[PDB]
Design an enzyme around this catalytic site. Structure first.
Site, PDB file in Angstrom:
ATOM      1  N   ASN A 175      43.182  48.739  32.614  1.00  0.00           N
ATOM      2  CA  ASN A 175      43.360  47.301  32.175  1.00  0.00           C
ATOM      3  C   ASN A 175      44.509  47.081  31.489  1.00  0.00           C
ATOM      4  O   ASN A 175      44.717  46.084  31.017  1.00  0.00           O
ATOM      5  CB  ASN A 175      42.180  46.799  31.566  1.00  0.00           C
ATOM      6  CG  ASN A 175      41.100  47.046  32.404  1.00  0.00           C
ATOM      7  OD1 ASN A 175      41.060  46.940  33.587  1.00  0.00           O
ATOM      8  ND2 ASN A 175      39.847  46.896  31.669  1.00  0.00           N
TER       9      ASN A 175
ATOM     10  N   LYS B  24      40.996  49.657  28.235  1.00  0.00           N
ATOM     11  CA  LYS B  24      41.173  51.066  29.127  1.00  0.00           C
ATOM     12  C   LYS B  24      42.509  51.259  29.880  1.00  0.00           C
ATOM     13  O   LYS B  24      43.260  50.220  30.227  1.00  0.00           O
ATOM     14  CB  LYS B  24      39.843  51.348  29.895  1.00  0.00           C
ATOM     15  CG  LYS B  24      38.588  50.956  29.501  1.00  0.00           C
ATOM     16  CD  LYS B  24      37.480  51.404  30.336  1.00  0.00           C
ATOM     17  CE  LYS B  24      35.962  51.287  29.737  1.00  0.00           C
ATOM     18  NZ  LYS B  24      34.792  51.630  30.663  1.00  0.00           N
TER      19      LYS B  24
ATOM     20  N   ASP C 225      36.576  45.771  26.954  1.00  0.00           N
ATOM     21  CA  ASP C 225      36.917  46.794  28.064  1.00  0.00           C
ATOM     22  C   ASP C 225      38.508  47.289  27.957  1.00  0.00           C
ATOM     23  O   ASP C 225      38.718  47.351  29.166  1.00  0.00           O
ATOM     24  CB  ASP C 225      36.386  46.135  29.298  1.00  0.00           C
ATOM     25  CG  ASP C 225      36.227  47.174  30.642  1.00  0.00           C
ATOM     26  OD1 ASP C 225      35.570  48.196  30.218  1.00  0.00           O
ATOM     27  OD2 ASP C 225      36.548  46.960  31.921  1.00  0.00           O
TER      28      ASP C 225
ATOM     29  N   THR D 103      16.344  28.149   3.104  1.00  0.00           N
ATOM     30  CA  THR D 103      15.722  29.369   2.368  1.00  0.00           C
ATOM     31  C   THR D 103      15.113  30.447   3.368  1.00  0.00           C
ATOM     32  O   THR D 103      14.419  29.780   4.162  1.00  0.00           O
ATOM     33  CB  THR D 103      14.858  28.596   1.502  1.00  0.00           C
ATOM     34  OG1 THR D 103      15.482  27.677   0.745  1.00  0.00           O
ATOM     35  CG2 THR D 103      14.264  29.445   0.407  1.00  0.00           C
TER      36      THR D 103
ATOM     37  N   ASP E 118      41.935  41.769  32.912  1.00  0.00           N
ATOM     38  CA  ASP E 118      40.363  42.033  33.018  1.00  0.00           C
ATOM     39  C   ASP E 118      39.561  41.662  31.876  1.00  0.00           C
ATOM     40  O   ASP E 118      39.065  42.586  31.083  1.00  0.00           O
ATOM     41  CB  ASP E 118      39.886  43.470  33.424  1.00  0.00           C
ATOM     42  CG  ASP E 118      38.539  43.888  33.669  1.00  0.00           C
ATOM     43  OD1 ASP E 118      37.771  42.639  34.111  1.00  0.00           O
ATOM     44  OD2 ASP E 118      38.169  44.939  34.042  1.00  0.00           O
TER      45      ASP E 118
HETATM   46  C1  LIG Z   1      52.354  47.735  41.516  1.00  0.00           C
HETATM   47  C2  LIG Z   1      51.136  48.333  41.814  1.00  0.00           C
HETATM   48  N1  LIG Z   1      50.885  49.452  42.565  1.00  0.00           N
HETATM   49  N2  LIG Z   1      51.779  49.901  42.990  1.00  0.00           N
HETATM   50  C3  LIG Z   1      51.369  50.960  44.154  1.00  0.00           C
HETATM   51  N3  LIG Z   1      50.166  50.749  44.732  1.00  0.00           N
HETATM   52  C4  LIG Z   1      50.209  50.819  45.786  1.00  0.00           C
HETATM   53  C5  LIG Z   1      51.598  51.120  46.481  1.00  0.00           C
HETATM   54  N4  LIG Z   1      52.285  50.938  45.029  1.00  0.00           N
HETATM   55  C6  LIG Z   1      49.859  47.360  41.465  1.00  0.00           C
HETATM   56  C7  LIG Z   1      48.537  47.967  41.552  1.00  0.00           C
HETATM   57  C8  LIG Z   1      47.469  47.289  40.980  1.00  0.00           C
HETATM   58  C9  LIG Z   1      47.502  46.298  40.074  1.00  0.00           C
HETATM   59  N5  LIG Z   1      46.427  45.686  39.749  1.00  0.00           N
HETATM   60  C10 LIG Z   1      46.161  44.765  39.208  1.00  0.00           C
HETATM   61  O1  LIG Z   1      47.121  43.664  38.712  1.00  0.00           O
HETATM   62  N6  LIG Z   1      45.038  44.371  38.913  1.00  0.00           N
HETATM   63  C11 LIG Z   1      43.977  43.684  38.251  1.00  0.00           C
HETATM   64  C12 LIG Z   1      42.745  43.630  38.406  1.00  0.00           C
HETATM   65  C13 LIG Z   1      41.860  42.998  37.682  1.00  0.00           C
HETATM   66  C14 LIG Z   1      42.503  41.606  37.094  1.00  0.00           C
HETATM   67  C15 LIG Z   1      41.315  40.784  36.451  1.00  0.00           C
HETATM   68  C16 LIG Z   1      41.659  39.476  35.607  1.00  0.00           C
HETATM   69  N7  LIG Z   1      40.056  41.175  36.627  1.00  0.00           N
HETATM   70  N8  LIG Z   1      39.009  40.558  36.163  1.00  0.00           N
HETATM   71  C17 LIG Z   1      37.863  40.945  36.725  1.00  0.00           C
HETATM   72  N9  LIG Z   1      37.504  42.479  37.098  1.00  0.00           N
HETATM   73  C18 LIG Z   1      36.415  42.510  37.021  1.00  0.00           C
HETATM   74  C19 LIG Z   1      35.394  41.407  36.490  1.00  0.00           C
HETATM   75  N10 LIG Z   1      36.736  40.509  35.665  1.00  0.00           N
HETATM   76  C20 LIG Z   1      43.813  41.554  37.162  1.00  0.00           C
HETATM   77  C21 LIG Z   1      44.568  42.309  37.504  1.00  0.00           C
HETATM   78  C22 LIG Z   1      48.636  45.740  39.887  1.00  0.00           C
HETATM   79  C23 LIG Z   1      49.894  46.383  40.313  1.00  0.00           C
END
Ligand SMILES: C/C(=N\NC1=NCCN1)c1ccc(NC(=O)Nc2ccc(/C(C)=N/NC3=NCCN3)cc2)cc1
Ligand SMILES: C/C(=N\NC1=NCCN1)c1ccc(NC(=O)Nc2ccc(/C(C)=N/NC3=NCCN3)cc2)cc1
Lengths: 282, 282
Positions: B124, B121, B119, B159, B140
């Site tokens: 991620n 993208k 996945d 076989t 992710d």
């Molecule tokens: C700095 C920031 N934003 N800044 C801005 N925004 C608001 C105010 N200022 C920011 C925004 C989002 C993330 N997301 C994140 O780390 N996401 C994340 C999502 C999923 C996973 C994982 C391991 N997911 N696994 C999972 N998804 C579906 C099924 N398996 C890890 C990190 C990190 C930082």
């Protein structure tokens, strides 16, 4: 030694075949059982076999997870179908039909319940008695697979912006994994009817692989002259190389060769004999 | 409410994105963390992420299996790469290279360790800071798969007397599942360099599917005129429809576009800044 929990319930006896299968007696009932010893996916095989309820599929009576695995099963006194077809021995066409009909019912039942066997072979078809007319049961679910919700279905629910072409190409042929069982049935039927295997490295220069992917079975006209044209027709529709065009178990069961009421009556007769039983209302 | 065991260790705060990601503070250290909430294969994702140790792959700090799943991770202050490429925004080629180099190292590390992400993208790929030159981490792993001993290998040890042709045909292409990650990387790189997606239903009559299986990306010469020929060359070798001819991560890392010592020095510089640390002998 045998584990204590097994010895507790069963008295062990002589080898019936070979993995290894032993005769035993259940202490409680003084009746014979067979005990498959698998030297140390068995957990899954057990779980699959416990959920299935069909007269042509072997039932588990008990299970012991010790230094080796021990699976207790009903004793099939006729042994393996393999022993009936070795040495170019062959069955009467009528007997082939009775047995194949039951194999089809068994595999149809597996596929309706989302199970693919994947190791159908004469060794895994067991006969219930030494009489030629008897019940058969399919056994050995060690390679079997459970059809369920695929990662493909999940992948196709989103937009494929980032999705690889080969995934999209595989959609054309997905969901036909069950067809490998129908090919095996085809090979089994071929062997039963003719007393020899359709694909083999005996007296030929074509590789086994190339024989199989081209679908060019070894046809020896005089072995087959005695066999009906309808029998051979069904063989031909099962040994189709394209898995999407291959006959399913349903299509095989509708084939002219299996519209034989004598054969079907004999199967029902053998079922009634096996079953005992319980009184019913009205 | 948040579960008690989580509240015990963390004070929860504002939403960072959306599944949903929240800011929190670890009570023990008073330092920021991110908490991914997955509303109720996560067990596997956790197990995969716990075994992996690479600076461009996100690390799990903690996990709570409550009414929903809560995964605590390092906070990536730069957010998602997606936000840098939406609205036809595009990165300087130099910045694309720094980021892509790290993605390649990450995916190479996954593939060496028998993991396919599946996945990849812009959503991620997380940036470690709001500075343009920064570390990225891939996240992710919810669709990821572990490469291991296959049922194919087991099937091919016997076989194939009873074995179906399509199984034998699939031997030609087996063991290239990892190539779907390289295709995604290709699409990501395309987007980063150009500010638009290669395959899309925008202003065209060819279906998305047909665009992808033919490999005919939408090439707009004037968006690309500013981009180097070497950058585009690499894109072309990743967006190859035949998975066996597609560039692997190793081949991409050897491509002329990534033989850029300035870029590599900057990556090493950013690594040293991140790390703290412990005294060493000699
Ligand atoms: C700095 C920031 N934003 N800044 C801005 N925004 C608001 C105010 N200022 C920011 C925004 C989002 C993330 N997301 C994140 O780390 N996401 C994340 C999502 C999923 C996973 C994982 C391991 N997911 N696994 C999972 N998804 C579906 C099924 N398996 C890890 C990190 C990190 C930082
Ligand atoms: C009547 C008979 N022989 N007669 C003759 N011989 C000696 C003297 N007279 C006989 C011989 C062998 C069997 N075998 C059998 O049931 N085997 C069996 C094997 C495996 C399994 C299963 C469920 N195996 N599963 C497993 N295999 C590998 C991994 N998974 C079930 C039944 C049954 C009957």
């Amino acid at each position: 030694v045998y584990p204590k929990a097994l010895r507790d319930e069963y008295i062990m006896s002589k080898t019936l075949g070979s993995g290894e299968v032993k005769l035993a007696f259940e202490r409680k009932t003084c009746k014979k059982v067979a005990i498959k010893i698998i030297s140390k996916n068995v957990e899954t095989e057990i779980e699959i076999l416990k959920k299935l309820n069909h007269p042509c599929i072997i039932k588990i009576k008990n299970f012991f997870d010790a230094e080796d695995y021990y699976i207790v099963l009903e004793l099939m006194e006729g042994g393996e179908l393999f022993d009936k077809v070795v040495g170019n021995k062959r069955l009467k066409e009528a007997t082939c039909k009775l047995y194949f009909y039951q194999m089809l019912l068994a595999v149809q039942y597996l596929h309706e319940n989302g199970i693919i066997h994947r190791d159908l072979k004469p060794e895994n078809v067991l006969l219930s008695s030494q009489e030629e007319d008897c019940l058969i049961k399919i056994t050995d679910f060690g390679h079997s697979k459970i059809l369920g919700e695929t990662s493909l279905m999940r992948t196709l629910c989103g937009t494929p912006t980032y999705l690889a072409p080969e995934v999209l190409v595989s959609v054309g042929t997905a969901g036909y994994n069950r067809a490998v069982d129908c090919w095996s049935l085809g090979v089994i039927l071929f062997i039963c009817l003719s007393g020899y295997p359709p694909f083999s490295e005996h007296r030929t220069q074509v590789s086994l692989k190339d024989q199989i992917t081209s679908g060019k079975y070894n046809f020896i006209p005089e072995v087959w002259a005695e066999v009906s044209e309808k029998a051979l027709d069904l063989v031909k529709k099962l040994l189709v190389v394209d898995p999407k065009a291959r006959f399913t178990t349903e299509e095989a069961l509708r084939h002219p060769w299996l519209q034989d009421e004598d054969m079907k009556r004999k199967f029902q007769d053998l079922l009634s004999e096996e079953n005992e039983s319980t009184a019913k209302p009205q």
